Amino acid sequence: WRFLRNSRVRRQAQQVIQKGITRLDDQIFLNRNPGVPSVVKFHPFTPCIA
Amino acid sequence: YARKTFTIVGDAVGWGFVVRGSKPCHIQAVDPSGPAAAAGMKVCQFVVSVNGLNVLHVDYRTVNNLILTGPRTIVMEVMEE
Amino acid sequence: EADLTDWNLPLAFMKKRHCEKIEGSKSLAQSWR
Amino acid sequence: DAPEAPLPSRKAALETVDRLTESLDFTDYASRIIHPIVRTLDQSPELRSTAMDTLSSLVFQLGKKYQIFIPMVNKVLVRHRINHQRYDVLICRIVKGYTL
Amino acid sequence: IPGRLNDRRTPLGELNWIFTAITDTIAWNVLPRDLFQKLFRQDLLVASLFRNFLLAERIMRSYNCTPVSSPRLPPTYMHAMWQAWDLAVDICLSQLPTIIEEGTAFRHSPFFAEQLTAFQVWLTMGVENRNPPEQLPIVLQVLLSQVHRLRALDLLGRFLDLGPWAVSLALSVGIFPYVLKLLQSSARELRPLLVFIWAKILAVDSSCQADLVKDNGHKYFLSVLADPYMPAEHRTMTAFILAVIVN
Amino acid sequence: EYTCMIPRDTHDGAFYRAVLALHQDLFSLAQQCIDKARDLLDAELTAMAGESYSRAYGAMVSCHMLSELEEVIQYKLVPERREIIRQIWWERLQGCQRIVEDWQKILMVRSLVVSPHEDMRTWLKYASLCGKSGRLALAHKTLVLLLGVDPSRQLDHPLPTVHPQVTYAYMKNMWKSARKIDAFQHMQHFVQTMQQQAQHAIAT
Amino acid sequence: XXXXXXXXXXXXXXXXXXXXXXXXXXXXXXXXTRFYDQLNHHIFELERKGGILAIASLIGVEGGNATRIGRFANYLRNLLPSNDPVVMEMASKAIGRLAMAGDTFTAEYVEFEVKRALEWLEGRRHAAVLVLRELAISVPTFFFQQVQPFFDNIFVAVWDPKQAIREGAVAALRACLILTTQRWYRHTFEEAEKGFIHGALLILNELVRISSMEGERLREEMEEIXXXXXXXXXXXXXXXXXXXXXXXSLIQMTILNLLPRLAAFRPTQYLQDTMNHVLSCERTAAFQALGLLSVAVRSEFKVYLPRVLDIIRAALPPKVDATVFTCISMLARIQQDIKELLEPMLAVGLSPALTAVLYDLSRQIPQLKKDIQDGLLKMLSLVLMHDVGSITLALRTLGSFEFELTQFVRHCADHFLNSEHKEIRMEAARTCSRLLTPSVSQTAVQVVADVLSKLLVVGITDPDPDIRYCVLASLDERFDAHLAQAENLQALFVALNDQVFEIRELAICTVGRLSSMNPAFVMPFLRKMLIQILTELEHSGIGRIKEQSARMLGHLVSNAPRLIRPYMEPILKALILKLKDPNPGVINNVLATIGELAQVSGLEMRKWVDELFIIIMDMLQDSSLLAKRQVALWTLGQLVASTGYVVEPYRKYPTLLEVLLNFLKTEQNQGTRREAIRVLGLLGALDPYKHKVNI
């Protein structure tokens, strides 16, 4: 059940590229996080920006 | 081809058929005065389906076997040149 | 074939979480002695 | 079990079988008599003392085999508040796995 | 009835030999745990006539007697295993009205075949550790009996491969002296069998103390440490067993 | 193909359809058709009821086939009863009348599950059971099929002295023809060879 | 006592108080006929329809009869002039059944009753068509006297004010036509168009309905779930325009039958007029012409569907109710047109009116089925991921759809064990069983085991005895491995002793079967039963227990045959001694048992064959004095067919052939006479000369 989910995720997370790019018309957030810019990583399907 | 359905009920004769042409399954006889001829079925037609399920491409010996191992009342779909 | 791809995608240190959990026990009646 | 019979006969039957319970072996007969007991407990009040003891001895005989009816017969004890110390002890003895 | 009450192959040996199994089986079933060893395992002429006491309880309650014992025993006369005795006698004495006269070569009793099958079933579901299986004292007789030893040793292997309770249960039933003795047999059959069993015992047991090495049996292991004629698993177990003997 | 063209109200139609059903192991259909045949054939029996029994006889024989068809079900499934079935088959049959057609109809049913060579003693009696076997062609055919080898196209050869009763009967078929010379000569070689086959093997 | 109907009439006039009349038909036959004849007056004039059933079934019990006439013939004539047409209905069955006594004595008052109702098509008596549609169907020849007069005499009454006279008498002619066809239709058009607002169009339903046997049947073909063929457009437009004012109503229900009668037998223009007439009533009238016509001609309906499917598509989204869905399946037997109903069909609720025929509709249309499989699975999931009767039928429904479950089944048991309302528990058992049946690894097997024991508890436990029955009945070979488990063998042994004979009879089968798997528990236990049952058979003084003894023995033998081989002979000796000296049911069970025993035993049987031939032939010979020839006959067949003792008997008991062949006359039962015939086949055809020697 849980990992088969990612068929829809691996499609949907790329569907705006499939449909062609559109304006950067929004932001989710701007605030403090306790880390320096010596590392950044994005976790693909699940929320931890490290 | 023109195509139609008949409804067949098995008894002492079985379900009343002899097919003998294969990959287009061809009727060599329909049992006269038996349930198939009582239903009004027709000789030298092609059998296309049983209960809508396509049997046209099935071995006539396999057809003559598996109709008789089938259900009580058999719908059969049949085709003319 | 996503759940086959998900297991086909390899993973790390799988056995390493096992070993250090070294078991202990206590003596029975064992009156066969 | 049958309610129509004149009452001393009923009593004498419930009060006879009690001895047979401890002379013979009744292991195969659980279904023939537990249902008549669960009925006659409810049927009228006059027997709710003596009948409950007729069961108590049957419990003592059968031991662990009896476990299987406990979750059922627990509920009968509500339909009237029938209570009787030796039974109440023995069911606990069974749950703790020792009735020696 | 032919035989001399001391030969399992003869009918007069067979009924005794079956009776010998039945009595232990009731005892393990119906007694509290320690009392069994205290009476039926500590000493021979304590145990042996005690087995006969249950037979006495039956006949005496047939009549108007209720014979009684120093310790406070629970009753036994009713138990289902008695009907297994009575069937086994009827099977036997169906034949004797010809054997006595017509030189009939007698048909050996199916009792043990019927019994191990039931145990095999409880293993084959093997679905629990609850109400552990009562055939266990019957098994001990076939560990000796050459006629049927193989099947029993495998089934026992599977039981020993279950979790530590099953090991503990075999041990406390008194499997040990057989499993000690039987490594006397250098039969290659003990490689998948008694050696595997020894491995699983020792996997939990620190109390076995190179016993079969202060005794003679170890000569088995000294072969199947290096013997190539089977898969390396069998050497793995033996390397573990000799690594235990040095541990 | 032919069996399609016989009606459901007629006991012979029910009967051939029972034979097809059981050729195909359709055990429900076989039983259905058998007792259907009894329900129909009752007409002839009861119409001809009793009436010296010798009048009924031609119809009374009918249920002999229906019974042995049910015995053939048991034969297919139960190797354990096979020889008892064979003994019932022989010791029932001897009580029947001498007439050739009677045996004929029985043997077409038993041929479903027994070879001529397996049932050889019976087939020998059937060939013998008229002087002509009706006509000596049927004697000839049957005996040659029992021999498996054909003196008709091995004229100069010895006749087989294995399965010797078949060969003996073949000599008796030959006696009732031009073949008496072959018969008298082959009879000597055969009897001498029967003594050889016994006397080179005098053990239990 | 014998005259008890004068006591019963103080209660049966009230209803369970009628049951003494059915018990009186069960009492009268144990030869008390002319005393329980006194039921008749105590029903005929002293609810009474349920007593009149027992009068009409007393005809069923006492057959073609002379004695019945002076009661039944007299009342059924003489009480009619003031009778309520409802209570008359089982009395009209009594008329039909007394007409089946078609010998000399019945004919006069049957011929009267048929002529009586025919002339009254009295104008007041609406019971005319009720009595005729009974009598014209319940006597199958001499009715023909009516054929024209029946469609003629409509104009006796069709002017009188009751709408069931004006329409109902007209909507009903085709019974006259049925037996007229089993034996006219042309002249019936003249009654419709010209014999006659109301009574013009309705007769044009009737002649098409019967004129060939294919017209009427679209109704019995839907209920699962020429005469005037040239008259069509005229006999539509004119008789409809005359009758139209009656629409807004029984004309609607007769012209709803014209559409399918036209579809079956008289196909176009008439179908337009009668459909405009269907839509002349508010708007959700009984429009089931749509479905009924589709059974023979779906009438080019693609511009007509916005007149009827759009009532459904209007009715469903904001929520009579049953038939609405039923017409969509009768239409179906179009895919993308039906596809939009898949959201609104949900909206009416959960009732079988919706959900059972909605299952027939989801069955019907293969590519749309798969969406609502997932959707409807989600209804029954949402209902429990969160009305006791409807949720119980929801579990029964989970137990009937084939949709591709465990989460349900586990808590189905919890509810079952406590859902104290009887009928929940019954079907929740029949649920859990079949839901387990479809299911190496421990994980699934653990889930099987978990429910399986928790179910089995109820089988011994339930004080509602038939639940105990059904729980056991739900087990099969389909769970044999877990039935070979010892804890379950205890539950079986506990069941093996019981209050209810049938539970015991069922229980023995299981152990009989498992006897090949786990012999150590099973075998000895069975042996103990055997001795207990022989002891019972030896020292029982009671019929009931002797009978049950023999039954249970016989029942066991063939179910575990290997167990009886080793000590048959004292069983057989006992059975002989029971046969030897005496309700015949005990001897019947012993005969059946010899039959089974011989069949199992085989060659072993040979000794007692003759002693049995003696006994069984003396019993077959005495089957005039003692019950059921057929059973003794059946065992005689087994006794031969087992042993092979074939031709020997025919001369040894020389009376055989006469006896066996007289049975061809006497049996009056084809289902047992064929056994006598079978038996001769087993004994083998015997030479008539041999027969002649052997006299």
Swiss-Prot record, chain B:
Record's comment on post-translational modification: Phosphorylation weakens interaction with MTOR within mTORC1 and mTORC2. Ubiquitinated; leading to proteasomal degradation. Deubiquitinated by OTUB1 in response to amino acid via a non-canonical mechanism, leading to DEPTOR stability.
Question: What residue stretch is flagged as signal peptide?
Answer: none
* Compartments, as annotated in UniProt: Lysosome membrane
Residues of the PDZ domain: 5-81
Q: Which factors induce or repress this protein, as stated in its UniProt record?
A: Expression is negatively regulated by both mTORC1 and mTORC2 (at protein level).
Taxonomically, the superkingdom here is Eukaryota
Parts of the chain that traverse the membrane: none
- Assembly and oligomerization: Associated component of the mechanistic target of rapamycin complex 1 (mTORC1) which contains MTOR, MLST8 and RPTOR. Associated component of the mechanistic target of rapamycin complex 2 (mTORC2) which contains MTOR, MLST8, PROTOR1, RICTOR, MAPKAP1 and DEPTOR. Interacts (via PDZ domain) with MTOR; interacts with MTOR within both mTORC1 and mTORC2. Interacts (via PDZ domain) with MINAR1 (via N-terminus). Interacts with SIK3.
Report the function annotation for this chain: Negative regulator of the mTORC1 and mTORC2 complexes: inhibits the protein kinase activity of MTOR, thereby inactivating both complexes. DEPTOR inhibits mTORC1 and mTORC2 to induce autophagy. In contrast to AKT1S1/PRAS40, only partially inhibits mTORC1 activity.
Please give the name of this protein.
DEP domain-containing mTOR-interacting protein
- The organism named in the record is Homo sapiens
Covered residues of the complete protein? 326 to 406 of 409
Swiss-Prot record, chain E:
Tissues where this protein is expressed: Highly expressed in skeletal muscle, and in a lesser extent in brain, lung, small intestine, kidney and placenta.
Q: Where in the cell is it found?
A: Lysosome membrane; Cytoplasm; Cytoplasmic granule
Q: How is it modified after translation?
A: O-GlcNAcylated by OGT upon glucose sufficiency, promoting interaction with small GTPases Rag (RagA/RRAGA, RagB/RRAGB, RagC/RRAGC and/or RagD/RRAGD) and subsequent recruitment of mTORC1 to lysosomal membranes, leading to activation of the mTORC1 complex. Acetylation is decreased in response to fasting.
According to the record's subunit comment, the protein's assembly and interactions are: Part of the mechanistic target of rapamycin complex 1 (mTORC1) which contains MTOR, MLST8 and RPTOR. mTORC1 associates with AKT1S1/PRAS40, which inhibits its activity. mTORC1 associates with DEPTOR, which regulates its activity. mTORC1 binds to and is inhibited by FKBP12-rapamycin. Forms a complex with MTOR under both leucine-rich and -poor conditions. Interacts with (via TOS motifs) EIF4EBP1 and RPS6KB1; interaction is independent of its association with MTOR.
Report the sequence similarity comment from the record: Belongs to the WD repeat RAPTOR family.
Q: So what does this one do?
A: Component of the mechanistic target of rapamycin complex 1 (mTORC1), an evolutionarily conserved central nutrient sensor that stimulates anabolic reactions and macromolecule biosynthesis to promote cellular biomass generation and growth. In response to nutrients, growth factors or amino acids, mTORC1 is recruited to the lysosome membrane and promotes protein, lipid and nucleotide synthesis by phosphorylating several substrates, such as ribosomal protein S6 kinase (RPS6KB1 and RPS6KB2) and EIF4EBP1 (4E-BP1).
The molecule here is called Regulatory-associated protein of mTOR
Q: Which organism is it from?
A: Homo sapiens (Human)
Could you tell me the gene encoding this protein? Answer: RPTOR
Relative to the complete UniProt sequence, the shown stretch is 298 to 544 of 1335
Swiss-Prot record, chain F:
- What does this protein's UniProt record list under function? Serine/threonine protein kinase which is a central regulator of cellular metabolism, growth and survival in response to hormones, growth factors, nutrients, energy and stress signals. MTOR directly or indirectly regulates the phosphorylation of at least 800 proteins. Functions as part of 2 structurally and functionally distinct signaling complexes mTORC1 and mTORC2 (mTOR complex 1 and 2).
Quote the annotated effect of R179H. Answer: In FCORD2; uncertain significance; somatic mutation
- What post-translational modification does the entry describe? Autophosphorylates when part of mTORC1 or mTORC2. Phosphorylation in the kinase domain modulates the interactions of MTOR with RPTOR and AKT1S1/PRAS40 and leads to increased intrinsic mTORC1 kinase activity.
Which superkingdom?
Answer: Eukaryota
Tissue specificity remark: Expressed in numerous tissues, with highest levels in testis.
Protein name in the entry:
Serine/threonine-protein kinase mTOR
Membrane spanning stretches:
none
Which residues of the parent protein does this chain contain? 1531 to 1734 of 2549
| This protein's domain notes | The kinase domain (PI3K/PI4K) is intrinsically active but has a highly restricted catalytic center. The FAT domain forms three discontinuous subdomains of alpha-helical TPR repeats plus a single subdomain of HEAT repeats. The four domains pack sequentially to form a C-shaped a-solenoid that clamps onto the kinase domain.
Q: Where in the cell is it found?
A: Lysosome membrane; Endoplasmic reticulum membrane; Golgi apparatus membrane; Cell membrane
Which residues are involved in binding 1D-myo-inositol hexakisphosphate?
K132, K172
Q: What is the annotated quaternary arrangement, including any partners?
A: Part of the mechanistic target of rapamycin complex 1 (mTORC1) which contains MTOR, MLST8 and RPTOR. The mTORC1 complex is a 1 Md obligate dimer of two stoichiometric heterotetramers with overall dimensions of 290 A x 210 A x 135 A. It has a rhomboid shape and a central cavity, the dimeric interfaces are formed by interlocking interactions between the two MTOR and the two RPTOR subunits.
Record-stated family: Belongs to the PI3/PI4-kinase family.
Placement of TPR repeats on the sequence: 12-44, 45-84, 85-119, 120-163, 164-201
